[PDB]
Design a binder for this molecule. Structure first.
Ligand SMILES: OC[C@H]1O[C@H](O[C@H]2[C@H](O)[C@@H](O)[C@@H](O)O[C@@H]2CO)[C@H](O)[C@@H](O)[C@@H]1O
Length: 401
């Protein structure tokens, strides 16, 4: 199903995929082995669908939060870096791609959202979310807006929902409690309410997506946006005079973005596991490898110590790491995809006025908790009854669409 003797790589469309394809060319030049980089739509859903039938790319790139799930489903090969190779990347990046004791991906870079602002429209960007309504009125009088960011992906609204107490799964004593979901508590509700009120009072539009936000910021129509490192080179080319800074506070609490570690996994179905490791260890995770990708779209703070040090003085990366330190590294547990699906629905339904904030988050809490538990009890049934028809029939009924 997967062709032997070449490498197929999937990476998200906002990432430096042409830069990655140049690393693939260097590899073709040395080894004679061809490398095709693709950025399919809805990658993180596509990968488990094809990989489950034994198909898909040799290498999958995504933030580490989806990897525990892919690993629980048997879609990923355990990786085999030697100790010398492991020494080249920071310890906390290895930790993010460790699942049940096993390394399940190669860490590439640490990403967090920051506030991005146009210095010509707004020399002094707001410290607090609460100042945005008055700032938007001032800017509307000049034919501009205060803030636009992607409202269709809950990743972008999460920092605000988390500011006053929203959380995915409660983390204590080194473990996530999968029954303790923080999606409908008073702090989550307050943050989503603030966002919905911005929409109701006409300071933002519920339909705003990634491309709408990026164009408007890059063409100077809005004074602020919320985005990651991968967005910066488009802003460089647009010549807007921008700064990257700390997210505004909400109720005097820091915004708490969920932090991702962009990682590369090897497909368990892949007949090229050795070729894949040669590429990632010896071509991509080198100074020259990461530079080709970073020069395409910035990676953030990369996992490779040698090249991290080279980019450490960039104020935009310092701001990134200042926001990351206020937030938290996402869990990689298999229950994360349940969390994200439930919160996506809540934000879109609350924003568009289809449900109240209270109803939207009540149902997201219920759905997230129920789906997490279905993941949990599935693994338990397999431990009890093995890989068997009995356990297959229990699981089909338990996870019934
Ligand atoms: O919106 C939920 C979504 O958040 C994160 O996805 C990010 C990704 O980590 C970033 O690299 C960037 O590309 O934007 C994505 C959001 O559009 C989680 O990694 C992802 O699993 C989750 O569904």
């Amino acid at each position: 199903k997967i062709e032997e003797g070449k490498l197929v790589i999937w990476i998200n469309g906002d990432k430096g995929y042409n830069g990655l394809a140049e690393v693939g060319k260097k590899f073709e030049k040395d080894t004679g082995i061809k490398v095709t980089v693709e950025h399919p739509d809805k990658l993180e859903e596509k990968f488990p669908q094809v990989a489950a039938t034994g198909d898909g790319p040799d290498i999958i790139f995504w933030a580490h939060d989806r990897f525990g799930g892919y690993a629980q489903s048997g879609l990923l090969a355990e990786i085999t870096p030697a100790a010398a190779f492991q020494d080249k990347l920071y310890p906390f990046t290895w930790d993010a791609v460790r699942y049940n004791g096993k390394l399940i991906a190669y860490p590439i870079a640490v990403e967090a959202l920051s506030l991005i602002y146009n210095k010509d429209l707004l020399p002094n960007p707001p410290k607090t979310w609460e100042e945005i309504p008055a700032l938007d009125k001032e800017l509307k009088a000049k034919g501009k807006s205060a803030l636009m960011f992607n409202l269709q992906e809950p990743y972008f609204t999460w920092p605000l929902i988390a500011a006053d107490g929203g959380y995915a799964f409660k983390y204590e004593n080194g473990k996530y409690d999968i029954k303790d979901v923080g999606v409908d508590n008073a702090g989550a509700k307050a943050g989503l309410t603030f966002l919905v009120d911005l929409i109701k009072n006409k300071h933002m539009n519920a339909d705003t997506d990634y491309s709408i936000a990026e164009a408007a910021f890059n063409k100077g129509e809005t004074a602020m946006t919320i985005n990651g490192p991968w967005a910066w080179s488009n802003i460089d080319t647009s010549k807007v005079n921008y700064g990257v800074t700390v997210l505004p506070t909400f109720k005097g609490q820091p915004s708490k973005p969920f932090v991702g570690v962009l990682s590369a996994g090897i497909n368990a179905a892949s007949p090229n596991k050795e070729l894949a490791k040669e590429f990632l260890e010896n071509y991509l995770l080198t100074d020259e490898g990461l530079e080709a990708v970073n020069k395409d779209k910035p990676l953030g703070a990369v996992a490779l110590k040698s090249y991290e040090e080279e980019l450490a003085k960039d104020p935009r990366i310092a701001a990134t790491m200042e926001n990351a330190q206020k937030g938290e590294i996402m869990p990689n547990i298999p229950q994360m995809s349940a969390f994200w699906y439930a919160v996506r629905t809540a934000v879109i339904n609350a924003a568009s006025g289809r449900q109240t904030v209270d109803a939207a988050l009540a149902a997201a809490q219920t759905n997230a908790a129920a789906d997490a538990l279905k993941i949990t009890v599935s693994e338990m049934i397999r431990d009890l009854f093995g890989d068997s028809d009995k356990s297959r029939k229990l699981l089909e009924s338990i996870n019934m669409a």
